[PDB]
Ligand binder design. Sequence first.
Ligand SMILES: N[C@@H](c1ccc(-n2cccn2)cc1)P(=O)(O)O
Ligand SMILES: N[C@@H](c1ccc(-n2cccn2)cc1)P(=O)(O)O
Ligand SMILES: N[C@@H](c1ccc(-n2cccn2)cc1)P(=O)(O)O
Ligand SMILES: [Zn+2]
Ligand SMILES: [Zn+2]
Ligand SMILES: [Zn+2]
Ligand SMILES: [Zn+2]
Ligand SMILES: [Zn+2]
Ligand SMILES: [Zn+2]
Lengths: 511, 519, 518, 48
Amino acid sequence: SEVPQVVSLDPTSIPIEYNTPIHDIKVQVYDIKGGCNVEEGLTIFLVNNPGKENGPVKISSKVNDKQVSEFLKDENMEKFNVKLGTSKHFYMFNDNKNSVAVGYVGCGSVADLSEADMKRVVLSLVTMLHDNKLSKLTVVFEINVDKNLFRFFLETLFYEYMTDERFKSEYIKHLGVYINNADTYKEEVEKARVYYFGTYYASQLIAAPSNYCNPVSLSNAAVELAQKLNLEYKILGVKELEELKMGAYLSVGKGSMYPNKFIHLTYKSKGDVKKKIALVGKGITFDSGGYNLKAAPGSMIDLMKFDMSGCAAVLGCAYCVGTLKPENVEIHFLSAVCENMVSKNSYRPGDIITASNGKTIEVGNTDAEGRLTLADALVYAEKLGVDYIVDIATLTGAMLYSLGTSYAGVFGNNEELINKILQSSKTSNEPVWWLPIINEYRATLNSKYADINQISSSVKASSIVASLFLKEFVQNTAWAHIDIAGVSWNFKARKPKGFGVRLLTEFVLND
Amino acid sequence: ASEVPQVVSLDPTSIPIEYNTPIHDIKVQVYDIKGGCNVEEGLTIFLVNNPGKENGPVKISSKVNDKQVSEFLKDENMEKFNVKLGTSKHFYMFNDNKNSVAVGYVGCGSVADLSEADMKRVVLSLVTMLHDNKLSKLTVVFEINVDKNLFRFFLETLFYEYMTDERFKSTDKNVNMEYIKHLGVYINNADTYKEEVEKARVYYFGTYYASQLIAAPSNYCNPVSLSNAAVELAQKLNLEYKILGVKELEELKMGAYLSVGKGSMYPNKFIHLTYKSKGDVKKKIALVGKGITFDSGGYNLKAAPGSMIDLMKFDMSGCAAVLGCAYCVGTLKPENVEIHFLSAVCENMVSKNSYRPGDIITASNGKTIEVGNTDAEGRLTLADALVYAEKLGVDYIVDIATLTGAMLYSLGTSYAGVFGNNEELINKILQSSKTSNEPVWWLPIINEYRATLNSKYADINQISSSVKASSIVASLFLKEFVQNTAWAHIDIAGVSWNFKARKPKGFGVRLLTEFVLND
Amino acid sequence: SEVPQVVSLDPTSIPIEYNTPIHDIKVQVYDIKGGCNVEEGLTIFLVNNPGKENGPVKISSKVNDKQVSEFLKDENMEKFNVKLGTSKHFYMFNDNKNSVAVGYVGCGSVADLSEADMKRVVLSLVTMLHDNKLSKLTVVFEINVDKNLFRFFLETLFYEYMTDERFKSTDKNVNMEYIKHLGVYINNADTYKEEVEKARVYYFGTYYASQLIAAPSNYCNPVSLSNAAVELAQKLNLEYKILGVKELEELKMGAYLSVGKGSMYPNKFIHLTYKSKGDVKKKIALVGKGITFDSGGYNLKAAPGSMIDLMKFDMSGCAAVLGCAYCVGTLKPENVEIHFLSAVCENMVSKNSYRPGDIITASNGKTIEVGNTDAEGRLTLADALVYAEKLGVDYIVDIATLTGAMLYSLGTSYAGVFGNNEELINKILQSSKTSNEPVWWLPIINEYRATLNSKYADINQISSSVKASSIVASLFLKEFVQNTAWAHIDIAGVSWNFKARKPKGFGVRLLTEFVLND
Amino acid sequence: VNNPGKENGPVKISSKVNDKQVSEFLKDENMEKFNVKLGTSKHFYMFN
Ligand SMILES: N[C@@H](c1ccc(-n2cccn2)cc1)P(=O)(O)O
Ligand SMILES: N[C@@H](c1ccc(-n2cccn2)cc1)P(=O)(O)O
Ligand SMILES: N[C@@H](c1ccc(-n2cccn2)cc1)P(=O)(O)O
Ligand SMILES: [Zn+2]
Ligand SMILES: [Zn+2]
Ligand SMILES: [Zn+2]
Ligand SMILES: [Zn+2]
Ligand SMILES: [Zn+2]
Ligand SMILES: [Zn+2]
């Protein structure tokens, strides 16, 4: 498990932060009926105006401080508006002559916030936290959210508040929440904190550049994670991968100085097993394209450290599952990890390679490497004899032109499973849309020489074609495929989303 | 009608349209298989499968009312052939009356319920047997299971694919072109299937009519000639009609639609056809089709590799499907409905008179629009068509358009995408997709992208600056022009043209008609 | 007739120079065995040294002056070599105590100079004429050349020497002075004497063509070019007619008319005729592609390498045909009837332009599906070929800047010839030899014909699958000649001299030699 | 089989065939229903 180096200055591990300052925040949830106390730090009102305009801010909650309550009177507050994400905050002295900050974030005019909207709310709030030295934040909900959305608020807050400074060379210690029917929201708090970290852990792996995060260091990190969670683990090396005849997966890695590593973590519930699941993540630690090099305008080769986002989501999910400890489920966490590089040793456009199920594949484009690695992972996953196989992958850039940057696409061979994923999208608030596997396009994968083509020459619906290819490697097991090529990276914030950790955990939990 | 302007005298002044096609001379007779099959003149084709047995052997199960033919078609003789989807074989023999007969089969594979795609492969194989063989009659024996809709779909597709469009042929007409006069069909429970026959013939012609308008090049089919054809159609069907000209469009302040047509030598013409049932009207529907008779891109000229400027006569496919639907509706005469058939027809050209990238134009609902790309012209014309539609006071607005090339990257060439603001209406569309066998998939209008249409100067941007999901952004733009009516949008940019066969599909005619009929 | 203008500063004619300085040159040929007189101006010896690479200059001619003869002794000349294209200037006094200038141009080792080699020699000589104000040049041939190559020397010398200042205003060359006399010393001079005025005629045909080509598309548009052609016909007493739009409509030339639809200039079809006074034994139609500017139309020339700034040259074929009309009309061959044809128009972007996808109808009734508006040349030629065949001629030869693909097949030196008749093709190759305008036979590959099959129209203008566009274009044109020997000369690669930044006037001499020899 | 002169003309088989059933299949009246366009084919199964 020694990471090879070219020079002594090359890093030999991924730095990982486990103990984050988010974990130090004491959280308290209070009912809003008893009035709000404003004694310290920053207090923010989440305010809308239905009908409205953008109408005026009007505060409805009772505040147990004379000076603040004066500040918050309708005549002052109408000077401001509830346009989504708009905020104002002011420092003042309270009834005990102590310095208090008080303000609001506008939640617009609709009464049901979408995940997108709520995200805009949190971002405004985070901007104030990053701009202010505070011991404590207090948030009071003057809008209605359900339990899942409340938890989404917390996760998004923690995640966005946290700043990754691992490669560079003050946080609040308390969070108060005022909300109607407080007691029903309390269970969401620590769940949010677990969901935050699984997501942030995924992010750290994705953000970690390819010199740091390579097939050896990523599998080392996965082992260290399993050890900390008491998960069973197994890392398959080149020799075993050859014995298993994983020729599609091995071919992708031929050109890399980093030997292929296959990750297999296993969680088992205490109880009687009622569902066995294999979660398979695409783990290309750097996708240069291979001989089909990413040289075309817009191919974004500098982003391609993110091509192990699927693997990160699966690993982050492992954190959440290993921590929350759901019952009656056995989960396998799989990733065929490798690096797609240019070398005398690389596989070539046109090569015919042989998958572990015996299928010969003609490589039409070395930059369609993910589906080759996934083919062998899927064969491996099916041999585990599980009930559901779900794979998640940054597989096709075409997703940007279908669903874009907000919704991932799910494709599958089984409507019941697909529907379970859509439900988990609803409760996780990571949005997914069901796209079809159109069988009429299957003929385009008929190779003249091999059993099957890797790519289509004629069909531009590449996300569907890739799904048709993948489907050839699952024979008799319910399977779904989540393409996160569009959603994984947050282009505007210049960072990963850690997309899919919460989706997969909800999937596991809801079962 | 209006006079079509010409640059030279040899410029065509109308679209050639074939109404009385050879398919309409075909006499169809349907028999129940339980009565046995008579095997006489022409070509008798058995549709045969073998469930579960992939590439399984052919077995003819139907009673054949001829001793020679029954002997020929017995299991031992047929076992050398297999049912592989699309395969076919011709047989020759003498019957009990000493007349030579031609017989054969088309293989329908080993899966019992044929998809719409599978059935098309079967039909294409059948058509291959009709081509280059001068036959007076074809007889088809169904030894596979099909529901009523799939039976109709077989007939529609057969009629459509058999037909050959020679309107623009002159020196190269097919000397050997000769159609059957009779079509016999044997099927179990024949009486239940009979009602589908004329329905299929009507659906075939609506689709083929749309196909004719689309395949017609932009010199033949321009906004004046296309609106003229809509008038002629309306007169033949006794639909009400109104064609709005520029002066009337100006009065209605349709600035977004008018701006697109500024650079064309052909004046904008807005088609408005109306069917009204004689009964008491229970539902009112507007069907809106994109009617760009040629899309050069305008100043944002289609010059990039893969922009397929030579295909762009097809950018009135949406208008064509709405008109094809008008044919079907006006022919079948549904009760209790009032249907408006709408198209803002124009041509997107490069000229001293063209609108420019950056121009700010005002739609008929007062919204100002910043033009970011003159090649996103469809959504601008649809904006004003949607405002016009909503003022009619209908229950549903459905538009259909070759709107975004991105469709090819999302759903590809077989499935159209539907988007909308109302779930009930979307499900009705999806239901019509099932019964018409023209596949459509529901795609989301993702509100998070809406902010990317915020203009610094105008009320709204025509295009997104940052979002590449253009089919979704376009849908977001269109939604701004429907205020309080259930509305759905069908993007057929990917499915309209059959690239393999080098012809249009007339996609959407049957879909839209089923939608009207089922309601 | 009247050229339309957008503003009053728009030109309404092509400026044309007919009486050139070359025409003022008095040429005298003398037999070299009488010895050479060296009395004034510049006297240049053309010398080689067969079989000795970069061999020494040796002057073998007798020079009728003691002082000059001494100067050019082998001893004095041995320091110089005959490397092809090298040259030297000498200065001395002759017997008359007069200042005299002498030099040489090396013609290498091979005793048989190629077309390319001879142009190298002529270019070196012109370098000696430029930037030196001389009243007289004398050339002494100490190399062997046949009659066609001697004529080629003069034609090339005249053409290269001539500088086109029609569009110069504030930047004319103040030092521009042309010799008034040219003396030529050659062995067996009597046989070469008849080549001189032939060379002058050939030079002007070529120069005339180049003037038309070089003239930009604002000056040279379909009206002004057809106007020029009438003027030329009047000067030569050729019969002429220009067919205008209404006549073109009556003749149903729908392919040709569609290309011009987008232009502010009306289509003009040029038809000049030369007819011998004797019995007519051969009738010939010469067809020249005449696109005065090719923007590409809606298939706009926007791709890198499309060279839109060069497209004033897309009437190079018409220009070659008109230059041939000048030569034929001047030299007056017997036994022949020649029709000089061009369907002239401009390919532009407009509300009025034809579109990609349009189906149009040619004058022979064939419907054509336009796959690319930038393949306009073959549409205009289609109707011109139909017109040509209706004249009842023995041969139709077209010449056109038809396909950029020529750059990748033959390049900038050799034109391609395609045809439906081996005898006609061979006559063109033979004319290539005697005109020294190089041409190579390329095949019309019938296997590609199916790629022109259209789903809706009788035929496709362009291929869907085949990249060999010069072949595809020829297949298309062939569909418009029914039963007449026809050949097609694609000059897209050779028409413009990219290094010298000017047209060659390619094809005038080739076409004239074809007519003359037949 | 070809048909000189007649573009896409009918198929006519000239060879004598030593089978009565096949001889009858190959008669002009049957074959004229097909054409000689380059690459076009038809074949039929029968008993001899
Ligand atoms: N790694 C896949 C991928 C993922 C995302 C993008 N991409 C995301 C945004 C723009 N391009 C491109 C390729 P692949 O190269 O299709 O294997
Ligand atoms: N006419 C629309 C369109 C439709 C289809 C295609 N297209 C269909 C297939 C490939 N490209 C491109 C543009 P538009 O240019 O987006 O308005
Ligand atoms: N005018 C023809 C042409 C001729 C020459 C070149 N060309 C010559 C050199 C580089 N490009 C390009 C187009 P066309 O655009 O094929 O009609
Ligand atoms: Zn790749
Ligand atoms: Zn990848
Ligand atoms: Zn467009
Ligand atoms: Zn369009
Ligand atoms: Zn061109
Ligand atoms: Zn040209």
